[PDB]
Amino acid sequence: EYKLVVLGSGGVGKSALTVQFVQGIFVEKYDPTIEDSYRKQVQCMLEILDTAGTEQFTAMRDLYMKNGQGFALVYSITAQSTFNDLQDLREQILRVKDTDDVPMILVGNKCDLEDERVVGKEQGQNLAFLESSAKSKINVNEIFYDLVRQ
Amino acid sequence: EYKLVVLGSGGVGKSALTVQFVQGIFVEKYDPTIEDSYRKQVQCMLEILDTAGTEQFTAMRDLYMKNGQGFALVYSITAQSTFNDLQDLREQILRVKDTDDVPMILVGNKCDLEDERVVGKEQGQNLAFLESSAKSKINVNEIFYDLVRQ
Amino acid sequence: MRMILRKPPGQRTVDDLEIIYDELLHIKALSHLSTTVKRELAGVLIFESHAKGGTVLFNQGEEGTSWYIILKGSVNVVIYGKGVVCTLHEGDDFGKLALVNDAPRAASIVLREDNCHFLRVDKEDFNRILRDVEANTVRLKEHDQDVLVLEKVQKYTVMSGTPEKILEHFLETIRLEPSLNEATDSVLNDFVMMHCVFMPNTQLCPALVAHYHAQPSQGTEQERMDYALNNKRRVIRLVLQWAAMYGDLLQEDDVAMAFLEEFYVSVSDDARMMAAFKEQLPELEKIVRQPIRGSDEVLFKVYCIDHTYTTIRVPVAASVKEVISAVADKLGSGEGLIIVKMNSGGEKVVLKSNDVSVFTTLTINGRLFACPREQFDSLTPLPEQEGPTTGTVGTFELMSSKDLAYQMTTYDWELFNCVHELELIYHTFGRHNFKKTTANLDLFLRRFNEIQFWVVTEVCLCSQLSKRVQLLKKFIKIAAHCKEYKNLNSFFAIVMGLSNVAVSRLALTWEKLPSKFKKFYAEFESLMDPSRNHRAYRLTAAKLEPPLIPFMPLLIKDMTFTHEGNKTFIDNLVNFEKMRMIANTARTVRYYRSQPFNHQDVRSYVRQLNVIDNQRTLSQMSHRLEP
Amino acid sequence: MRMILRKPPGQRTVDDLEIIYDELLHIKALSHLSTTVKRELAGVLIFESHAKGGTVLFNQGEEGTSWYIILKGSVNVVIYGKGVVCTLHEGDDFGKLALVNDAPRAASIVLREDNCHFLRVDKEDFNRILRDVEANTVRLKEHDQDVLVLEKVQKYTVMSGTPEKILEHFLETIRLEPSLNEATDSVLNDFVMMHCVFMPNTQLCPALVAHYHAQPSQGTEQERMDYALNNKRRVIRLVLQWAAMYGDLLQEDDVAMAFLEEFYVSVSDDARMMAAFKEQLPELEKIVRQPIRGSDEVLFKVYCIDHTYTTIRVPVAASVKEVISAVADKLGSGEGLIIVKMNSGGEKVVLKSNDVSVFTTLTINGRLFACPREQFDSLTPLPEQEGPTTGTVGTFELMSSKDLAYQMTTYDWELFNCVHELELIYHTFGRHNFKKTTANLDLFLRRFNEIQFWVVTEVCLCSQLSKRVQLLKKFIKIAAHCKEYKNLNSFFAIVMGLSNVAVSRLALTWEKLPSKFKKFYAEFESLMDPSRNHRAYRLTAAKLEPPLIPFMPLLIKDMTFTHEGNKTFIDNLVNFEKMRMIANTARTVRYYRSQPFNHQDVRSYVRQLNVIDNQRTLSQMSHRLEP
Ligand SMILES: Nc1ncnc2c1ncn2[C@@H]1O[C@@H]2CO[P@](O)(=S)O[C@H]2[C@H]1O
Ligand SMILES: Nc1ncnc2c1ncn2[C@@H]1O[C@@H]2CO[P@](O)(=S)O[C@H]2[C@H]1O
Ligand SMILES: Nc1ncnc2c1ncn2[C@@H]1O[C@@H]2CO[P@](O)(=S)O[C@H]2[C@H]1O
Ligand SMILES: Nc1ncnc2c1ncn2[C@@H]1O[C@@H]2CO[P@](O)(=S)O[C@H]2[C@H]1O
C-alpha cells in the first residue's frame, strides 16, 4: 500500500497524468467514481491522490498531504506563473504531517509543445527533475516510479 | 401434463419420431439424460414415453402402458413382420390399466421410401391412421396432435 | 436448394438441413457464429427472392419483424427527408437494430436492382437463437461515414454519433403511451441535459422546427397522415422535456425563447386545424435566496493600485473584456488594463479577456483589481481583506448547538437549491464555452470554505485556553447535528476546520478536551479517509435517503475527472458514453434534492459570517496562543 | 503510421491511439468486436513487417505466444509429413488455437511471398482483451476442406474432424509430465474408446506406426532430435492407453496383436539405441464367472421342425451365415435354410445372414430353429421352452431374505464385471458393424428378465392363498435388501415382477398383505415413475457411491437415444460431440464399478433359476388361482 499525491496549479496537467498512469486516456473509458479509480499495481499497490478539480478547497490538499507519502510538483513549461506557484506547496507539505523530510519530484509537464514554451529546462533544473508530457506519454510512469524509490 | 407412449417392433422408427418431435435431429444435439429430454410444450406439456431400445424388457413397456394416456402403434411399410406384430400390443394395453377404451393411432412410418415398399396404404387402412416419415418429417407432429385430441 | 430454403422450417428433412448447413458455411455474415448456432439456423433461415428493382422490403416507422442477409443484388437504405443514405451489397446484413431494441425501423429498405436474393430470420427465431450471439456493433452510415454507433451494454445503446443522427434517434424512439411516461422521459434525459455540449440551441432549435414539419415520402394518405401526426407528438414531447430542463434559464437564451414562443403558435394552430394535441397543448401553454441569473446586474467595486476603486454596473455573466471596458468608461482611460484577482494573502492571478462571470469565483476575502501590466508585482491587499481581529464567541456561545446546525442546514439548502443542474455542466466544460454564469454553484462552493475558515477564525481568536476547549467541544457538537440533518457538506467543513494546521497545533487545548469528544472527532476524521476513492465517505452517503447535501468537493472532483479522463469526440463523433457519465453525476444531485428539507438571532448570525481566510495570519495567531 | 504501430504500446500518444483506432475500423478480422474492445487493442496491437519470402513466423511444436492478422501478402501453413496444407491471405488471422488452449503450435507458418505485413497481439494482452470475445470457431483446413473444427464449450474442444486429423490432435496435445498423468489419460479417453466407430485398428495401427517414425522437417540437429524423441514418447503413451482399453479383447484382433508385438520390438530396440523410454518400456512389456470371448467355442443345439436337433460347434462370434453352413455340414443339405428364433409363446423372428453372435440374444426360454422358408408358419415351440409346472417355495422359503439378496448381488456383480465397456459401444452401433460379440452384456441384460419372471413364476405356481401372501412379503424383503446392497438392477426386477399383470391381479393376496409391506411396495413402485425422464430413479442412483449396479434398461435406453438422436458424421466429418456423449455414458458404468463389492445352498439356488417366461401361461395360471 502506497499513497502518492499530485500537486500544482490548475491547467498544469495533473488529472491527465493521473489518468494516463492509472489506466490510459481513450483506450478505456475512465470512471472516477469506483473503489479502484486511482489504484494501480506496479510489486506495489499505489493510490494516486490528485488535487485536480479541488484546488480552491485548501482543506482537500491538506487532507491529502496528511495521507501522502510521495509528492509530485507539476508545472507547465508553457507557463511562468505555474512555475512560480511551486515554492509554497513544498512548504505546506512540511507543516501538515509535522516532519523534516518527504520524498518528492519536480515535473515540467507539457514538454512536447515547444513553440509555446516560456520556461526552460535550466530554470526547472536550477529549481528529482523530469520534463514530461501526459498526452505524448513521455515520462508518465517514471514520475511515479521515482517516488516509490524515494 | 400429458403422457404419450410410442410402441412397435424394433427398426420401425420410434426413436426417430420421438426425437424429431421433441427437438429435431441435426439442428440440435440430443441429450437423452436430462429432465426435459422427452418433454415438449404444445396449450399442453407432453412427455413421450418411448419403448425404443428397451423392447426386450417387457416390464418397461408395461410400466409405460400403465402411465400412458395415448398410444402410437408404429410399423414400417417396408416390413410385413412389423405390421403383423401390431395386434398384440393393442391387446396388452387393455390389461395393464384395467380398462375398455384407450386413445390411440396407427402409424405407417417410412412412407418416403417406396421402391422398398411391401405394405400398402390399404392394408394399414383396413387395419386413426397416418402414413408418416420421421426422417422426411412427414406427419411427425400430427401423430401426437391427434392423441391429445383423443 | 431454393426449394429447400423456401420450404417452411417445419417441413425440412434431415438431409435438407445437412445440405443447408454446408451452404451456411460459405456465408461470411455467419462466419463468427458457432457450429451449434449455424445448425439451429439451418432449420429456421428463409430464402426470399424478388424480381423487380424498387420492391420494398419494409418501410421506415414499421415494427422490426426480420433480420436479413443479402445473397444477391443490392438495396437502398431510404430515410424521409434525406433520400438514399446508403446502399448495401452482397454479404451485408440489415434490420437487426429494430428487432433487438423493439424500436421502429429508422429507414425503409428498397431493392436497388432486379432479382435480389435474401436470407431472412424472423423475430421469435432471432431472439431465441441469435440475440446474445449476433453481437456485432450496429454502425449506421450516411454517404460513407458512420453517423451512429450502438452497442450492447438487453438493448443496443448509443455509443457515439453525429448531433443530428443522435437527435433523430432519440426522437423516433419516444413512446407516447401514458404507462411509459417515466421510462420515455428517462431515455430522453441524457440528450436533453447534455446537448449544450454538442448541439447548442442555435443548431437544435432549427432542427426541431424542421423535424416538427417533416412529412413521410411513402404510404397511403391515411398512413402518411398518421405517421406525420405521431412525428409531431414526438417532437412536442421532446420540446416539453427540453423546456423543463431549462426552467427559468430559458430567459437567458433569446434564440430558445423565440423558438418556443413560435413553437407554441405552431402547435396551437395545428391543434385546432388537426384536432390533435389535446393533452400536450395545455402542458405547453403553462411554460409560455432566489437564484442569481446571468442577466441580473451587479454593482461591483474594481480597485486601483492606490486602493481607490470604480463601481461598475454590468450583467452577472459579463466577460473580463466587458469588465475592462466598463472600468475604462469610468476612469476615462486608453492605458491597457488587466484584471487581477487578489487574495487576502497577497496571491495574484491575471484573468483572461475570455473569462466570464468572474465575480463569484473570488476567494472569500478576494478583491478584483484593474491595472496596467507594469503594476502587477506592486499590488498589495486591502485592510478589508484581512478579516476580523476580535471573536464572536460571546454571541454564538449563547446559541444552542442544535439551533446553529439547523439554521446552517436551512441556509445551505437555500444555496444548494439555487444551483441549476446545468451549472454543473457549464462549470465542468468551462464557462467561456457557453458564456453562462455558474454564480449559484460558485457561491455554494465558497460556503464550504467559509464554514471551514469560520471554525479556524473563532478558535484562533480565542485567547483563554478554557473557553477554547469549550469552542472545540461546541464545533464537534455542531458537526454532529449537521451530519444528523444529512448535511454532509457542512459537517465535513467543520471537521476539516478542526483539522486545519492552526487548530491541530493546539495540544494544550486538545489534551484538555473530554475524551468523549476526542473519540467523536477521531471518528469524524476517519470518515474523511481518501482511501479506496473515499470509500468511508462514499458508503456513508450511499446509506442515506434523498434530502441530503453531499460532500461538494468530491462531486466537483468526480466531474473534473469524468471530463479530463474521457474524450468528448471519438473519430469526429460525439462520445455519448462520456455524455451519459456526466449526466449520471448530475442526476445524483437531482436525487439528493428530490425530497424537501423539514430564532432570528441564530439565523442572522449563521448567514453573515465574517472570516479570516489568510492562512499565514491564522498560523501566526495560533503560535502566540500556544508557542 | 507504421512508425506509430511500431512504437511500443506504452509509447503511443493519445492521438496515435485515435489514429490507430480509425484504421482498426477498416479491418475485417476485427469487425465483430465491440468499440470497447477495439480501442483497447489500439494500445496493444503490433505492426510486423518482413521482407523475404520463406521467413518463418513460428514453427510446429513451439509455444503459442501470438495471434496474427495478415495485412499484406500471404503465408503457408506447413506441417511435418504433409508439407503446405494451406495458404492464408490478406484478411485471414492465425495462431489463436495454441494461445487459447495453451497447446503446442500444430503447424509452422512461413511467408509465401516477399514483403508481408502483420498485426500481432501477444499472449497476455490477447488473454486480457480477446479471450472471451474472439470467439470464432477454429476451422483447420487441408487442400480446401475442413479437417478439424474446434469450439469453446475455457478451451476450444474438438467438435468434428477427419479420423487422421483427430488422431494428430490428440497425439500432439499429450502432456508427459507425471503431475499430469490423470489429466492426460482423461483427455485421450474419448478417442481411445470411440475410435472403433470411426478409425478401426486396420487404419489406426498403420497410422500409429507412421506417427512413431515421424521426423521434423525444420530445426537444428538437437531441436530435431528432441522433437522426434518426444513425438515417440507421445505415441507410446497413446498406445499404452489404447492397449489398456482393450485389455484381453486384443486377442480377438490379429491386426492389433501383430501391431503391438512389433511395436514392442521397435520401442525396446529404440530404448537401447537412444537410451530413452526408461519408464514407458517396462509398462509396455507387462502388456506383451469369467468373461466369454468371441473366439470361445460353443456347442449349440439348432432345431428342426420335427424337434430333432443338430449340435454345432462354432465360435461365440459366429455370424448367422456361419451357423447355417455348420448346420448344412451336419444335415448334408443344399436346401436353403433360414435361422429363426422362437420364443416360448410361439413368437418367431427370422435372423439375417448378417447377424453375429446371436446365441446370447435369445429370450430366457428361446430356441434357434433352422428350416426352409416354407416351414416358417408351421414351427411350434418345444415342451422344454414352457418352464416349470411346480414351485420351489419349499426350497427358498427356508432361506433368509438377506442371504438370497446377498447371493443374488454377488452373482449380479460377477455378471456385470464380465461386461467390457466396449460391448456397450458394439451393442449401440450394431454388432455386425464390428463382427464382435456382446455375449457378456447380453447375459447380464437377460438376468433382469430372469429375476422378474422368477417372481411371477413362483407367485403363479403357489396355489395356497396363505403361503402366497408370505411369498409377496418375502420378495418385498428380498428387493429391500437388494436396494440396500446398492443392486438397483435386481431391486427393480423384483419390483417389476410384483407389478406384472398376473401378480397385480391377485387382490385376495394383496388385500391380505400387512399394510407395512403394502407401504414399502407402494414406495418402491413410485421410484419407477417414468416422470421427467425417470427423475425418481435418476436422483436415487445419483446419491449413491461407486459400488452400485444401475437400472440397466434405462442405461440401454440412454445409449439408444444418444445414437439415434445424433448423427455420427456431420459434413462428412466425425461428429466428435456425439462420440463424447456415448463415451460419457460408458464412463458412468466404469464409475459404478470403480469400487469392489464387499451358504452353498443359497448360492446354487440363486444361480440356477428355472423360469416361465410365457406371459399367456402365467396369466392363465393367475386366473385359476383367483378367478
Ligand atoms: N419504401 C420507400 N420509403 C421511402 N421512400 C421511397 C420508398 N420507395 C420509393 N421511395 C421514393 O424514393 C425517394 C427518395 O427521396 P425522398 O425525398 S425520401 O422520396 C422518396 C420516395 O419518393
Ligand atoms: N444511416 C442509417 N440509418 C438507419 N438505418 C440504417 C442506416 N445505415 C444502414 N441502416 C440499416 O437499415 C436498417 C433499417 O432498419 P433497422 O432495424 S433501424 O436497421 C437498419 C440498418 O441495418
Ligand atoms: N518453418 C518450417 N517448418 C516446416 N517446414 C519448412 C519450414 N521452412 C521451410 N520448410 C520446408 O518446406 C518443406 C515442405 O515439405 P516438408 O516434407 S514438411 O519439408 C519442408 C521443409 O523442407
Ligand atoms: N490444417 C491445419 N492444421 C494446423 N493449423 C492450421 C491448419 N489450417 C490452418 N491452420 C492455422 O495455422 C496455425 C498454426 O498455429 P495454431 O496456434 S495450432 O493455429 C493454426 C491455425 O490458425
CA contacts within 13 A on the Cβ side of D603: 4
Interface test with D, best of A15, A27, A29, A110 (most D CBs within 10 A): A27
* H/E element, A131: strand A129-131
Decide if A62 and C533 are in contact by the 8 Å CB cutoff: no
Distance D105 CA to ligand 4 centre (A): 7
Query: In which residue are the cell numbers 500432439 written?
Result: D172
What single DSSP character describes residue C218? S
The whole-angstrom separation of Cα C612 and Cα C453 is 6
Using DSSP's 3-state secondary structure scheme, residue C341 falls into strand
What single DSSP character describes residue C267? H
Residue with the smallest CA separation from ligand 1 atom 18 is: C83
Touching C (3+ Cβ pairs <8 A), the chains are A, B, D
Residue with the smallest CA separation from ligand 4 atom 19 is: D95
Other beta carbons less than 10 A from residue D383's beta carbon? 7
The whole-angstrom separation of Cα C316 and Cα C357 is 6
At B19, phi and psi to the nearest 5? Answer: -75, -40
- Known binding residue A136? Answer is no
- CATH 3.40.50.300 corresponds to the domain A1-150: yes
- Known binding residue A14? Answer is yes
Distance D77 CA to ligand 4 centre (A): 7
Contacts of C546 (CB under 8 A, 6+ apart): C591, C592, C593, C594, C595
- Known binding residue A139? Answer is no
The whole-angstrom separation of Cα D297 and Cα D318 is 9
Burial of B43 (0-12, 13-18, 19+ CB in 10 A): exposed
Query: In which residue are the cell numbers 442515506 written?
Result: C544
Interface test with D, best of B63, B81, B95 (most D CBs within 10 A): B63
Cell reading at C35: 457450429
8 Å CB contact between A55 and A64: no
8 Å CB contact between D294 and D359: no
8 Å CB contact between C456 and C502: yes
Burial of D323 (0-12, 13-18, 19+ CB in 10 A): buried
The whole-angstrom separation of Cα C338 and Cα C352 is 8
For β-strands D138-142 and B45-50, DSSP reports them as: unpaired
Give D14→chain A minimum CA distance, Å.
Answer: 6
Contacts of D410 (CB under 8 A, 6+ apart): D597, D603
Decide if C553 and A57 are in contact by the 8 Å CB cutoff: yes
At C81, phi and psi to the nearest 5? Answer: 85, -5
Contacts of D374 (CB under 8 A, 6+ apart): none
Structural domains of chain C, with CATH:
1-45 (1.10.8.1240), 46-161 (2.60.120.10), 162-292 (1.20.870.10), 293-386 (3.10.20.90), 387-627 (1.10.840.10)
The whole-angstrom separation of Cα D251 and Cα D293 is 9
Cell reading at B27: 439442428
Query: Which residues sit opposite C78 in a β-bridge?
Result: C84, C108
What single DSSP character describes residue C352? P
The type of residue at D456 is V
Contacts of D18 in chain C (CB under 8 A): 567, 570-571
The whole-angstrom separation of Cα D544 and Cα D527 is 15
Query: In which residue are the cell numbers 512540511 written?
Result: A94
Contacts of A135 in chain D (CB under 8 A): 13-15
If DSSP states are collapsed to H, E and C, what string results for C92-137?
Answer: CEECHHHHHHCCECCCEEEECCCCEEEEEEEHHHHHHHCCCCCCCC
Decide if C10 and B141 are in contact by the 8 Å CB cutoff: yes
For β-strands B70-76 and B104-109, DSSP reports them as: parallel
The whole-angstrom separation of Cα C578 and Cα C569 is 9
For chain A, state the CA radius of gyration: 15
Interface test with C, best of D23, D34, D96 (most C CBs within 10 A): D34
Using DSSP's 3-state secondary structure scheme, residue D520 falls into helix
Burial of D224 (0-12, 13-18, 19+ CB in 10 A): middle
Distance C243 CA to ligand 4 centre (A): 61
Distance D268 CA to ligand 1 centre (A): 82
Which chain C residues have any C-beta within 8 angstroms of a chain B C-beta? 10-15, 17-18, 21, 36, 39-40, 42-43
Cell reading at D162: 477427419
All structural domains of chain A with their residue ranges:
1-150
Determine the residue of chain C that is closest to D34 in CA distance.
C137
Distance D95 CA to ligand 4 centre (A): 6
Query: Which residues sit opposite B41 in a β-bridge?
Result: B45
Other beta carbons less than 10 A from residue B150's beta carbon? 14
The candidate with the shortest Cα–Cα distance to B49, out of B81, B96, B83, is B96
Burial of C295 (0-12, 13-18, 19+ CB in 10 A): exposed
- Known binding residue A58? Answer is no
Cell reading at D21: 483506432
If DSSP states are collapsed to H, E and C, what string results for B88-100?
Answer: HHHHHHHHHCCCC
Using DSSP's 3-state secondary structure scheme, residue C541 falls into helix
The whole-angstrom separation of Cα D484 and Cα B60 is 23
Distance D80 CA to ligand 3 centre (A): 7
Resolution in A: 2.2
Residue of B19, B34, B56 lying closest to D533 (CB–CB): B34
| Structural biology method used | X-ray
The whole-angstrom separation of Cα D551 and Cα D494 is 12
Give C106→chain A minimum CA distance, Å.
Answer: 28
8 Å CB contact between D69 and D93: yes
Touching A (3+ Cβ pairs <8 A), the chains are C, D
Contacts of C585 in chain A (CB under 8 A): 33
Angle between helices A58-67 and A86-96 (to 10 degrees): 60
- Known binding residue B9? Answer is yes
Decide if C39 and B135 are in contact by the 8 Å CB cutoff: no
Burial of C308 (0-12, 13-18, 19+ CB in 10 A): exposed
The type of residue at C373 is R
Give C13→chain B minimum CA distance, Å.
Answer: 5
Residue with the smallest CA separation from ligand 3 atom 20 is: D217
> Both ends of chain B: CA-CA distance in Å?
15
How many contacts does A have with C, using Cβ atoms within 8 A?
Answer: 103
Contacts of B38 in chain D (CB under 8 A): 533
8 Å CB contact between C70 and C116: yes
What does the longest C-alpha to C-alpha distance in chain D come to? 102
Contacts of D587 (CB under 8 A, 6+ apart): D189
For β-strands C309-315 and C297-303, DSSP reports them as: antiparallel
State whether residue C149 sits within 8 Å of chain D by CB: yes
Residue of A29, A136, A141 lying closest to D13 (CB–CB): A136
Cell reading at C111: 431493392
